[PDB]
Amino acid sequence: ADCRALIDKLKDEQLLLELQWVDLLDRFDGILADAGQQLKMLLLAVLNFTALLIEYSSIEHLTTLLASSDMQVVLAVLNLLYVFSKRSNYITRLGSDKRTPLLTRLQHLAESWGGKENGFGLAECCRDLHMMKYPPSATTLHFEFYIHIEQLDKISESPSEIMESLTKMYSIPKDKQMLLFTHIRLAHGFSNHRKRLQAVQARLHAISILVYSSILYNGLIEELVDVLQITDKQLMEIKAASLRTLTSIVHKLSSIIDCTGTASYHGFLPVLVRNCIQAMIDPSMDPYPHQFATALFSFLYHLASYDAGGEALVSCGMMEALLKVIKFLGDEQDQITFVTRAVRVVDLITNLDMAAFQSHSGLSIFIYRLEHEVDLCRKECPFVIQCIPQRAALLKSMLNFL
């Protein structure tokens, strides 16, 4: 089928991956085993696409590529490992031949920076702060196993070149130079905004992978909420990553609820969801990025599935906004997908309260949406005595609710 047509088309390859199984995944695992030993951007596109293929023999090469100076590729590997960890237990069942080297590299990415008490909270490292309001130890390398290099920002030498110089100048403990490399590339990053942000995102992804499969602490939830509450609006990617990390963590739930504020109609998460919904409904309000909205709804679903979260979504009255979504949202594939997510969330809530749903006339709204989608199919297939997949999933979840 069209999967086979896409394969034949791919089998300008990099131009097609930029536009966007066995022998295509094998050519990919090829170039993975080749690049890690006009190259880096091919690896990045291979990764960015593979993180879609798994979402509907690479583990070793991916851990080998998680050890790279360029953060783009680290982020891509992390995003692929997030996809695997979140949707199937592919790396959890794996043997300790490479599962442990992976989880240890992830731990060395994830491990704390000192949070708010010491001056290295996640929120602060996303605002610029002029580079003079952070602790002076941010550009200080103190590897002890005893290396105490300082001002790695002043030093302009490539990070990998510095690591190589350290490798030769000192005998670094075998099979654990990774924690040095991650400290050095962090201390190079923190000097500048893009690299600080990328390291923050990498740490967040590493957490989430390490939890879908010592890193977590009392301040982490607050710090993530603070990342969300940043008003810059240029950090949507970071905010989405933070929300995904919170979703992982949920898999402390009372603290997540107390911080996000879901117990009251006025609260950061409820207000944020309502704004996202209004921007999705009304053209005038700028639509919140698709990824961010996806993360928000996924968080809501993953919360509602727990009784404390479903009771909080009762308390803040999210059923009214979600029925607003299922009533006024359009017909386009992304909007269909948001409607499906909303219906699933409503189903998870109505598994413990009915009064809100009934009071909001929810059954009428569901039936009207089912009529509207069947009427939009009626144009393609008017006979009465293939469907677009997203609409079929909508119909399916809504009939399951009925």
């Binding site: 009071s359 059954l363 009428s364």
Partner: protein, 127 residues
């Protein structure tokens, strides 16, 4: 113990809150001195859309005398002289008096209230 309910609320306790398809009423509304595009009518529909299920039901009781929703829809709304549709008449008396209902005609008389808030307040006090 029953005396805590009103005469509306006792009906809503025995027979339950109906779900009012305000869109069905709008599709079966007749405007006599107002028009379907009169500004007082857009304010009326905004108010009635903003009322909760209980205030919608209390409105339905106020204008039809019952919470019963007709199976065929409000097109089949009966009155004193045969099938009577719901109906909104402009009350040309002073606009310092409440709306008034004639349930046998399913008739609302509505003063030309100067604002959304005042019309909504008076209607909510009526229901």
């Amino acid at each position: 113990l029953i005396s805590i309910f009103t005469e509306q609320e006792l009906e809503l306790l025995i027979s339950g809150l109906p779900t009012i398809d305000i869109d069905d009423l709008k599709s079966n509304t007749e405007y006599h001195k107002y028009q379907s595009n009169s500004i007082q009518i857009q304010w009326f529909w905004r108010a009635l859309r903003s009322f909760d299920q209980a205030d919608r039901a209390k409105f339905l009781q106020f204008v039809t005398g019952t919470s019963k929703v007709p199976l065929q829809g409000f097109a089949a709304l009966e009155g004193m002289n045969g099938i009577q549709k719901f109906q909104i008449h402009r009350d040309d008396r002073s606009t310092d008096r409440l709306p008034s209902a004639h349930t046998c005609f399913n008739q609302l008389d509505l003063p030309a209230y100067e604002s959304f808030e005042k019309l909504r307040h008076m209607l909510l006090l009526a229901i």
